[PDB]
Swiss-Prot record, chains A, B, C, D:
Changing Y90F: 3550-fold reduction in catalytic efficiency. It catalyses: galactarate = (2S,3R)-dihydroxy-5-oxohexanedioate + H2O. Changing R162N: 17000-fold reduction in catalytic efficiency. The keyword Metal-binding applies. Belongs to the mandelate racemase/muconate lactonizing enzyme family. The record marks R162 as: Increases basicity of active site Tyr. GO terms for molecular function: lyase activity; metal ion binding. This is Galactarate dehydratase (D-threo-forming). It comes from Oceanobacillus iheyensis (strain DSM 14371 / CIP 107618 / JCM 11309 / KCTC 3954 / HTE831). CDD domains: enolase_like (cd00308). The active site is at Y90, Y164. Binds 2 magnesium ions per subunit. Catalyzes the regioselective dehydration of galactarate into 2-keto-D-threo-4,5-dihydroxyadipate ((2S,3R)-dihydroxy-5-oxohexanedioate). Is not active on other acid sugars.
Amino acid sequence: MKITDLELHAVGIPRHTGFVNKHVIVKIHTDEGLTGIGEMSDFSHLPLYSVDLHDLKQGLLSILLGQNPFDLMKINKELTDNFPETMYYYEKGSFIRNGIDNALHDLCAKYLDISVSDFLGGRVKEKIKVCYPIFRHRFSEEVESNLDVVRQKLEQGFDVFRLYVGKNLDADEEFLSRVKEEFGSRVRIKSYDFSHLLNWKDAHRAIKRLTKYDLGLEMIESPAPRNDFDGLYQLRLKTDYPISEHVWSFKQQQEMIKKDAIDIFNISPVFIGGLTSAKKAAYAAEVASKDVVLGTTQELSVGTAAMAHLGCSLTNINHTSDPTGPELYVGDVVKNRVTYKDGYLYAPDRSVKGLGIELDESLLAKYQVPDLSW
Amino acid sequence: MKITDLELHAVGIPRHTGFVNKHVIVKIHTDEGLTGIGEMSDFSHLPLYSVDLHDLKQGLLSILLGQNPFDLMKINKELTDNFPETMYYYEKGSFIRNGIDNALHDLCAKYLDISVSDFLGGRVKEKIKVCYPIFRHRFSEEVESNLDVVRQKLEQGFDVFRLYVGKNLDADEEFLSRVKEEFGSRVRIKSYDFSHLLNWKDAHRAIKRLTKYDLGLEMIESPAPRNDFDGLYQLRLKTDYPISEHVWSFKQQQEMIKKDAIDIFNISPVFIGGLTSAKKAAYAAEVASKDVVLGTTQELSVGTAAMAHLGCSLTNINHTSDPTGPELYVGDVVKNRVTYKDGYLYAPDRSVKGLGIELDESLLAKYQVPDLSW
Amino acid sequence: MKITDLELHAVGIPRHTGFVNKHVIVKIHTDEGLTGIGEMSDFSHLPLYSVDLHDLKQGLLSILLGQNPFDLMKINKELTDNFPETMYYYEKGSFIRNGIDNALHDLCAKYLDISVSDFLGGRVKEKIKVCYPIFRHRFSEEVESNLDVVRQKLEQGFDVFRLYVGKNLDADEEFLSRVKEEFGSRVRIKSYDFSHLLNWKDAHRAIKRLTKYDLGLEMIESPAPRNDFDGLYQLRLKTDYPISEHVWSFKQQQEMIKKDAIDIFNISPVFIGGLTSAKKAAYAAEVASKDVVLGTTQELSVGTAAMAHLGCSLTNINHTSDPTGPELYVGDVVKNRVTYKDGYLYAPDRSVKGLGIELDESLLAKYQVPDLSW
Amino acid sequence: MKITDLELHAVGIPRHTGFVNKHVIVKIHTDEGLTGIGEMSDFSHLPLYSVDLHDLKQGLLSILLGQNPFDLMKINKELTDNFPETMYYYEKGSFIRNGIDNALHDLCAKYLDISVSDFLGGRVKEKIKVCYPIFRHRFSEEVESNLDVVRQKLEQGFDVFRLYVGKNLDADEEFLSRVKEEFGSRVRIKSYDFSHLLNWKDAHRAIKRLTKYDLGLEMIESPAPRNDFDGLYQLRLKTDYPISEHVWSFKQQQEMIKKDAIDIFNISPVFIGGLTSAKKAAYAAEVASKDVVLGTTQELSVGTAAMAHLGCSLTNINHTSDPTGPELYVGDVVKNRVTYKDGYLYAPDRSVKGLGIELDESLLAKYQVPDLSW
Ligand SMILES: [Mg+2]
Ligand SMILES: [Mg+2]
Ligand SMILES: [Mg+2]
Ligand SMILES: [Mg+2]
Ligand SMILES: [Mg+2]
Ligand SMILES: [Mg+2]
Ligand SMILES: [Mg+2]
Ligand SMILES: [Mg+2]
């Protein structure tokens, strides 16, 4: 059983807001005709340079050609050797490794005629609670528009949201006051996300006035600069609420564990390099008796499905997660877009082998983009 | 696909030394006729009390009956809920969980018609280097006998050994001097194992005189009392050689990681509760950029095979391991025992489904024992 | 003067709630006809396995046979060698050592024709204040039932209780509000016990809202996971109230002392291995200028009497203790069940030699159980 | 059973060197005619003031009169309340409490018709290894004289000595060189005692040149100023050999434990206030997994016997102790002095009740002194 070819399809699916994110859909072919599909989700992040996909395909074929897809540990070591972890949130090498490793999981599962769920340790639950994002306000003039978003997603079933804060605290505060006023307990904002834009002391001040509003608040995310482990720790000690942070490299995670800097590890395959790497991160968290939540970069259906299977196999997810990427796009490239019901992401049909998602050649062709250029 | 019955066979296989260790061979049956086999290896350790196997079978059936063997994460959480980690090296609950989880791996692999190796992440190598143990001297009068053991195992291919030290340093020293003298570089003693019997400062003194002899020395193991994390750390700082310690609970491992107390994590399924738990421990080590070696409690072929598959799937095993249990027994309960050659333990033929080991009913009957009584 | 035989009687005494706890009553016979009695209190705790009493009797006879009961230090070292401390709250080896050491105290005292009190250092007081437990609420619907419990025990003299909290804070809060309302200062809740189910930060949040009600509150017990010494310390620093924790091993106690992690050491013979071990723990606490309280696992009269003698001999017990085990059972196996008056546990009659409690063969036969099976 | 009177006899027994040390022999009488004897050993230490024995007798009678001698915990708390621990090596209050508590142990044991050994926890061994002291050299001219002392005590059975060092390192070095030369391995110097006269760094330098000679060296004692816990710790880290220090108060011991400042706790009843306090110190050491040795202030037979019983009841004495006080005096006030054989102190005949030592009125009369004046 061996890998014989690889395909990288660049696609651009516009968000309802108009901005077009670029993704790379992965196909790994074998000698027995089985093909695994994966997704190098959202390349549209800084740094402001783009990867040559023709060159990339050659490099990856050099790595995978002739290999046994079941040698996940071996292949992942080789992938990491060529695309080293960078300690940077949006390292493009992580997105690349992610697409390949996830496609490998789909491939192996298909070969074994089982769901990716059964290749990941089975089911602990059938679905995980997720939230819809409300992006940070810059002016109080945006509050009204965001209240409309909340009302709309709420009727569609999303009763939990996460709010990006830090730019305009007066606006953040107005929004929260308005939601509490109009929706009462009908809606919950499980997280106030600072996205690393404030130093911990400024975050503490913000946290102090924002938490005046507690609508089912579960965590404060990224309340310190990237990799400021000591700052996270100090803030963790002054904050009643759990502190969460994204995991972007094992080195970074190792340091936050050693220092007991955070309470919840926000893990997402795309940022750590795939399902294999995400499981390791999740297990490291488990060994350290720490909670986990699934994060997101706004992936499409194929990338979101990966997390659906992973999330339903973990025993240490006790809070609301973030993967609602499909909700932000006008379309996708699959035959069956992932489904959200009552603010929940369900694991794909367990009787369907592989990832449980199927690509649609017509859509792949429709959203096709020449390259990943900016 | 569900579990329908469970069998626990207590057996007593005498060591070449005469002492009879007791083990419990596990069989997990399903509705489709597939059966997984496992081993609750060596119950003959303190505390000086024994488990009622009739009661145990009922308790475990209560847990497993009707479950889908592929729900490893779910089942393991339930197993840990009923047999909590104890922070004690020889917690019998660990041996119990181990036998069940390993049998589940064999069961799932058989169902999928693949080797346990392919269910664990594939192969990184086809074999791992192991060592044969030379137990601690009490009197210098024992040195000669142990030199005979070294000469015998060496001609059988074992060129690497581990030496238990700490009781009689003069005897330890004579042995090492004699081996260096007679065998030169033909033999290596990869570890000096104190087995937690000395406080770190006394170990440091011992390490100082013993390391005068360096025959391919790779590590100093358990040079401090059980759970003395601070002592291990201090000793790690004063010792040039890597410090290794057995992993017996996630809490203990978490603390040694946070404190950077050791250099090599000695992991063995039996002491941590099975393959699922051992993989998590191995991955936590990997995430922390720490080395791993496979340890042992002197298991039989079924338990040793588990480590053979695990060991060949890990990318962070860069030292010699310890599983040579079968070499200490006069027999086993399998059709074909594990295979050693030139001091290496080979992972069973990847073409064979399951664990690649098969029970022998007549041998099971032959070594059968009524209970686990002392 | 030597030990000639040993007897282990397994018994099951149902609680008023119906659940039947199993205990093992101990009898140690000598060559001079004197017999010491002890109690391996409440074996009904996880792990979910049970000890073979036939095997256990053989192992213990192997240890005790022919020994001089007055060699307590020697015998206890040997007991600990065979039943090592585990760092786990409910290590069955502790229960076993406890029953033997306590029976030895009874035996020696009888031989000397003095009360166990006079063998333990005499009297500092004649009784110690204790409290009755109110188990944790899961639903607010249980509050009424627990208020009835409080009213009933209060009229029987128990004006002090301990409350298990952490599962449903809204329910915990309602209960406390209701008691303050109905009983005012007539009743005191000396402790809010989290039983290690919350990580320290979540406990801190709970402590913050629960302590809004202070009905003679004396301590916050186990507000962190088992063995989370650093967490206890951090919480100790953020909490005005004393922090208490159970002592289950010398290693654990040593760490909480070194780190100044807690304010009150909750000591109970059953969890530390007997009177000899409990005295050492109490004295270590004294040397460290730390307060002590006697804890419980809900023992019967024989086990409770042990604590009555111990408690009245210590000079560092300045808070309310927990041993009201007999109050939860429908019966016992003694001729004289322990005395509770005005919420106080009195030390047995000092003029009666030994423990001051006598077994009742008829009751022993009535509550006899064939084994410790689950 | 109650205390009815107390007697304090001041005595002066000259050392073979001529200097006359003063001690106070204690007698505690009861209503049943039983009398306990104790010893307030060696009052001849700074500070340069002396205690009024007439006043002291009144103060102690005020405390003890009418009390039940078996109330050791109660009486000791009261003794400590009136003679608080001082954190100073030679606090006279400790000597005072010691004499009373030890007399109480003798009294209780006599009442029960058992050996003090059986009142202290029994026997673990029948004797403990001790050493003879060689006082510090000031001039190299003293070396010869001390070699004569070694040769003399060696033929009498004392093959182990302790050497006081620090004043003249050249002399210390010559002595050690001369002993190694003349006696070879016939003699051992188990400890180099600095007696707190050097700051830790100067001690380290001394330790470096003195340990060039290792004649069965077991420990380095008091290598730092009194109560310099941090200095002891730092030195403990730079020294291969165990570091030992005398225990003179629970506060001091608590700090050395918390800081892990030493390896061996040198405990002596006289410096800590008696058998009751010495046992607590020994147990605190045990709970902390630390080794213990019995120290000395050069007591007579009654005080030395106390340690003989204590020493043979402890399980954590794994090194040579120091009580050879009787060997330095020309006489005593007992009918039969303690027994040494081959460098061991034997616990008095266990079949003899009480301390196993009896006073000689004739000797008491001939050695009596008017007071404790300097
Ligand atoms: Mg975020
Ligand atoms: Mg993105
Ligand atoms: Mg080992
Ligand atoms: Mg073993
Ligand atoms: Mg409690
Ligand atoms: Mg209990
Ligand atoms: Mg000294
Ligand atoms: Mg003196």
